[PDB]
Symmetry: C2
């Protein structure tokens, strides 16, 4: 197919061979990350070179390596030793998840802690959480995991209902030593169960819901070719999948009559952090980079037809590598289908007597992932009118704690003695822009209020102002919902028929950005989350807003470093990074299982077309 096709099990196997053959994949080596590389910048480059990037961990304690291999030419293009204390630790390995609980089970401090609380060690689940970087000097260079305890009364019990507060352990998962066990005091362990599948809790199930059937008697309107190439209602794109980012969209273009006009070169959620706002030492270090530290694509669910994806669905089953280089397929990991989207355009004209109504539709490309207690759905939508939209759906079980006697300013009560620490889920959408090609620029557009007086005697006038971001040093922008602030990405060398540079306007939800104090560790490690919009000059090695190795990285790694280059972004190959998230103060209705909460953003054509691009839609 094209150089944008999904990785084959064969390519994964071929990467495994090349590595072992080069002596890079011994018995103590584990693949922490592996993913195909996107074709480099060009056009007439028919010579295909499928390369894969790999992060290799060594369970002995030896320095890890970043290796790039060429599957097309069975070679090791590069292999470098990483100084994790300098560049950060590799992504948390799924196999290290069990380790924290196992090591702790034989630690006397831990056992002493459980004994004081009368908790059976065999019933205490331990959540292997990322460590971050705080004041523990002995952690620099070491691969640390922190553990919080939750009691599971029985196999099918929801342990989240029973947090063991006042206790936290730090574990060196390489040397296998419990570096520390902190017990700040016994807290009552919440007793009510949160088993949402227990009839005693749910009550008799409803019998009132009649079925809703969504069918496509003639099949879907989109076509899938070359495995992942989508063609639908003038749109054209390639659906990729990466173990770290999940679903990635490539070459989003719109066929405007004769031309296939590019809009976005690459769209992905490049990072997703979940910072907690509880100042208790038991949790004050808690910040989960679901994408950067855990890798969201790795945990993508196999979606069941009729349950997760309703209607006429076309699935993609992406292949990833396991810790040993063996290919693993995520059956039905990606859903593709078109949804009716109500009214597109409507007008009943008195003067002409013409009554006109048209219906809208959206192409949907989604996947759902699970990172411990949270579950997130990632949805990309393409609309008939040219609008592109992203929506994240957050659900799962809330991360719990004990609810302090006397209340709390940073924790809310869900059940008797059960608390839910305040937190945020902040995303970063990386949009490698290609508005009618790569020569793009960004303008910040604000509504402009005008004062009543000469030229505006009735005081009714209002305008808009656009400020072009010319250098990266002036491309770190904040939201301003009050002045209806948006950002327009245009091609200054491609003009519509009214001789105006074609463009697309980004409409943000203007939700709060990172709340943490500016001098905090999380503010420095997830600096991208402190501002709504960033614009950088494209560079193939600038992939994530938080850098390539997020785990235990000290600070300032991604966007702040890239931006510091201060490159020219006025009419250049540029990338837009939009920060957007949810700020959560959990409610009683989020317990025992959370109903979906959503956030997103969208981009609408702004003088991109010469008139409405949906005049050819039939009466339907």
């Amino acid at each position: 197919a094209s150089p944008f096709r999904l990785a084959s099990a064969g390519e994964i196997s071929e990467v495994q061979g090349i590595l072992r053959t080069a002596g890079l994949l011994g018995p103590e080596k584990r693949i922490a990350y592996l993913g195909v590389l996107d074709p480099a910048r060009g056009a007439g480059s028919e010579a295909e070179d499928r390369r894969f990037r790999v992060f290799i961990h060594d369970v002995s304690g030896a320095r890890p390596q970043e290796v790039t291999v060429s599957v097309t030419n069975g070679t090791v293009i590069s292999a470098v030793e990483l100084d994790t204390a300098a560049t950060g630790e590799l992504p948390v390995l799924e196999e290290e998840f069990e380790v924290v609980e196992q090591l702790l089970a034989t630690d006397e401090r831990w056992l002493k802690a459980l004994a004081a609380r009368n908790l059976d060690v065999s019933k205490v689940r331990v959540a292997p959480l990322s460590a971050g970087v705080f004041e523990y000097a002995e952690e620099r260079g070491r691969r640390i995991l922190r553990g919080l305890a939750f009691v599971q009364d029985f196999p099918e019990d929801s342990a989240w209902a029973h947090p063991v507060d006042g206790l936290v352990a730090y574990v060196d998962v390489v040397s296998k030593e419990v570096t520390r066990v902190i017990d700040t005091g016994v807290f009552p362990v919440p007793a009510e169960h949160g088993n949402y599948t227990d009839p005693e809790l749910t009550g008799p199930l409803r019998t009132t819901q009649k079925p809703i059937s969504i069918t496509q008697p003639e099949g879907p309107s989109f076509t899938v070719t070359g495995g992942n190439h989508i063609e639908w209602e003038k749109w054209s794109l390639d659906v990729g999948f990466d173990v770290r980012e999940g679903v990635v969209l490539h070459n989003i273009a719109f066929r405007d009559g004769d031309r296939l006009r590019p809009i976005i070169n690459r769209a992905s959620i490049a990072e997703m952090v979940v910072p907690y706002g509880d100042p208790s030492p038991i949790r004050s270090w808690q910040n989960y980079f679901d994408t950067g530290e855990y890798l969201v694509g790795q945990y993508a669910n196999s979606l069941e037809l009729g349950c997760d994806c309703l209607g006429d669905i076309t699935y993609l089953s992406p292949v990833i590598s396991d810790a040993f280089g063996n290919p693993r397929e995520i059956r039905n990991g990606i859903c593709m289908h078109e949804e009716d989207w109500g009214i597109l355009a409507k007008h009943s004209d008195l003067w002409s007597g013409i009554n006109y109504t048209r219906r809208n539709r959206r192409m949907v490309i989604s996947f759902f992932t699970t990172i411990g207690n949270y579950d997130y759905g990632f949805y990309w939508y393409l609309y008939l009118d040219g609008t592109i939209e992203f929506e994240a759906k957050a659900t799962g079980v809330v991360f719990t704690s004990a609810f302090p006697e006397g209340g709390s300013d940073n924790i809310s009560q869900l059940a008797p003695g059960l608390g839910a620490p305040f937190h945020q889920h902040i995303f970063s959408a990386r949009l490698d822009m290609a508005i009618d090609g790569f020569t793009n620029r960004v303008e910040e557009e604000d509504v402009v209020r005008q004062t009543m007086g000469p030229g505006n005697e009735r005081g009714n006038a209002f305008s808009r102002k656009r400020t072009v971001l010319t250098r990266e040093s002036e491309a770190v922008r904040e939201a301003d919902a009050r002045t209806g602030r948006t950002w327009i990405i245009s091609n200054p060398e491609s003009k519509n028929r009214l001789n105006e540079p074609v463009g697309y306007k980004l409409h943000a939800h203007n939700q709060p950005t990172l709340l943490a104090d500016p001098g905090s560790s999380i503010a420095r490690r997830a600096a991208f989350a402190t501002k709504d919009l960033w614009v950088t000059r494209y560079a193939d090695d600038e992939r994530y807003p938080t850098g390539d190795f997020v785990n235990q990285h000290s600070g300032g790694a991604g966007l702040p470093s890239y931006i510091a280059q201060d490159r020219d972004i006025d009419g250049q190959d540029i990338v837009v990074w939009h920060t957007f998230g949810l700020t959560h103060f959990p409610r009683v209705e989020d317990w025992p299982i959370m109903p979906v909460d959503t956030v997103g953003f969208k981009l609408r054509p702004e003088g991109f077309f010469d008139r409405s691009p949906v005049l050819d839609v039939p009466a339907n």
Copy 2:
């Protein structure tokens, strides 16, 4: 039956008979407004008393009257003569619309202006628009409409493509006189047609859209009882319809186990204003109160099955009065149906091995109206989890002008020589709150950022603060998207099992509010649109944010006068008035017919329930 039942044809004819019998409806009288009044406050309602309020116009020029009749008792409860120059003119009568073009067609000033542009008067359509209140002293006490011309080249031509700039006329529609004709100079009349059904413009219609069939084999899950009483997935409410407000929701409540718990006593879009931001004298007076001046409900479209409402739809055909008091039915004017809404809750738990997925659904109640070039869809949604949401959908044809040769700061170009003046579409949702009953209170909730230091040593803590609005004087609030500002309506006397007052949280979109200078006529007439949220103490005569008579009415009534009463709203029968709207800088993509743009708000339970209310939702 239920005192909230829709008005029947018989009741309307009876109101006519009662007015006639009372000598209030002779041959010169016209009904400018007629609607049923809601049952009086309380509980011990001694039998049914269906009362209707009527605004009676006199075509001979005599003073109009406001009358309330008891259709049950066959009596006139009150009838007062109105001094329109003081209290405002009655809503525009449908019959007065055509009058503008008719009178102008024989006016020599108008004819000279047309001849100067070489336009055939028989092809010049005139958009009859509300006049507002400006410096025209002779207009005080008279019913005026202003006219803007558009050329219609042939019967089926869209005149909006051909605006005649530099010209405007004012007309007294009662005395049938053209009071003024202002010609500021000729502007080329845009030549390109905007005929969206002309194959020459649309091009060949797409053959790519495959059908999306949505069916309900066993029928809908909601039941319609007593004509307009709906019961669906624990929800209960009555769907009313008023000629001014359109769809109005009454007694929204949720059956939580044994108890039917009220949430919102009455919800409606109590006003909507469309102000224009072009300082040209030809349009600087332009502002319409589609609800208050035109009465959106009377222009509701008859919805076609399959095109307007897809799926298993249950229609209501509300009856309204014509200008003479005879009943008229808007066949299929309201659509009711439930629609699938993706994932409701989902969690795949490692520890328990339990994988759980549930789907969401929403009850939809909608209607679409058309007033001139604009068409608006009003949609109310009720979700399984207890969320209530409203969404307005703006479409139709953009109101045009000429595009100034040297560009414009207040008008955008759509086609060669065709301009689109900037404007807004601002709505006011009046929510008569009844959270678990009438004893309610409103708190403004802001996210609170904390400084790193003692008690927050790692600088990760963040909190929330709630400020109770105790008196109406402190109940006029603005948005603050940056601090995640929301407003919680609670019942200080009804606590959940965790001993917290039950409540609902209002999530606004935080769009810009009224942009006009504060000293402008529109800022005073649309004072409500200058702030995001208002809370008043309920009063039966405080129905609209702009007062009872908006047409050509200055400031002096509405919210600003109500609030001055400075009543107690801390644990009392209160009403929330939320302002939300769209700010439009028309795009080429909006021509020749605009794709739907949306805006709205939603309310989510906030400690209302004792745990998630959807644990009894069965697996698909």
